[PDB]
Amino acid sequence: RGSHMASMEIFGKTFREGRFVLKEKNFTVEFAVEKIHLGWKISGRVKGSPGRLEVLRTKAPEKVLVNNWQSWGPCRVVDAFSFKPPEIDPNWRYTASVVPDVLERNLQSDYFVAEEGKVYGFLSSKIAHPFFAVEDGELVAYLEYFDVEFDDFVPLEPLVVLEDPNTPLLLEKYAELVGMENNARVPKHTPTGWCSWYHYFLDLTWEETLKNLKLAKNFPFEVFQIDDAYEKDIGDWLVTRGDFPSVEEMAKVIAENGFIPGIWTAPFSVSETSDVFNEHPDWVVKENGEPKMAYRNWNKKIYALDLSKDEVLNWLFDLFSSLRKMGYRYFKIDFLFAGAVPGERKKNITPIQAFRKGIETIRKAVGEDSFILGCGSPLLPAVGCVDGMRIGPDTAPFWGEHIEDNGAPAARWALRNAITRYFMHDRFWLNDPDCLILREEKTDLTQKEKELYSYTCGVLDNMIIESDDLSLVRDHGKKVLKETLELLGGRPRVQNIMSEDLRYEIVSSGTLSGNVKIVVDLNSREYHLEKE
Ligand SMILES: *[C@@H]1C=C(CO)[C@H](O)[C@H](O)[C@H]1F
């Protein structure tokens, strides 16, 4: 009976409970509008050529929590009316949007959008990409089918519209419904461990690795994970460089030392220089019959594997099978968005359908006993496949006090996303807030910043992985980690999720330290923690 709800349109008609049919020239939608706890659900099926299918239209709120489709992109509150299109980096187009025609004109939010007291959220992204655009003062929900044709009906991605003054509660409920819809993997045990990247970056040597592997026996690390550095090229995962042994030999040394071997790949990415690409130029997504650049990194054009091709999926299966055989049981799989870039594939399936085949192949290959950590990944499409997911831009050994909020590395913005995507944790997957950087030297992080970052992550019950030259972690670093792990185990809530001043009140019930509250200020870099 609300005046806002009378103002809503669903598939172009007025919002009310029922079963409905939209027949147009090019497509047919059959949908149901059902009442559910705390709002409404729209579900059904579509066939024909739905293209960019308008699902919902309502008046655009002034302040919206918007969400980028992938790990690194911002989840933040913006003013819907004063939006100006960003300059899009030609090297990273698709991190910004899978539909960049939208974002060069209009405010875009992927999967969900919130305002004070309301959540609009799609429960899945299996076939279509679900997004919202603010178009001349209206919020419009779309399902993008990328010009794919369906002879027979396929399921819509369901949409929920939830309403209640407790917006955090709504986001948590939304995420519960996503997790149900996609059979989310929420492991009962969270791995601790070590990651090479945020100290050594691409300059990691096996020599330095071995030093840290020895020191790691003194730290509470289960996993020891080799990051980007070991591989000869992007796509040539089983060929090492420099002073590294074979990929199999690395696993055996790590295992011999009593750790779970972890390894980094970018499994949907092949560089223009790689052996795999040069051997198989028809394995990639194309544009005008020619390889289409998915992004530019490592000073190379990087192409996307065409995950509609059986030869490609077999290759992935064989790769990850091989790695599992060697003893790897922790897989950090990066730049996953590449697999979902728009373009020409062998089969006329959506980039999301392709993406899902790819990640499902990896899951099958590594088995149920392996931990998969997603990163640089579309979020909804991965639910049910990954165990953990990076939900923020990279951290860094500096705060980023005047670094722009554009998805680039900075502790300040990594932590912001850990806070604003908190509700995904223990519902979609385990949230990975990125590594703690606790070293005393070779850092521009202050002790107070280290504390703020680490204690926040602990209160949020998020994955705790450390990334340091362990030689440089002394009493202060060890204490911060110890105290962090004491804050795990709870059910967190960010009580003021629509905050625009980067000050957040965060509670967590039932931690190893009881009920806890941390108030954090990411501008002033202050926290105040109460443990009861
Ligand atoms: C993806 C990329 C790298 C290094 O190339 C790191 O592993 C980062 O944490 C990931 F998001």
Ligand SMILES: [Mg+2]
């Ligand atoms: Mg109207």
Ligand SMILES: [Mg+2]
């Ligand atoms: Mg076909």
Ligand SMILES: [Mg+2]
């Ligand atoms: Mg938990």
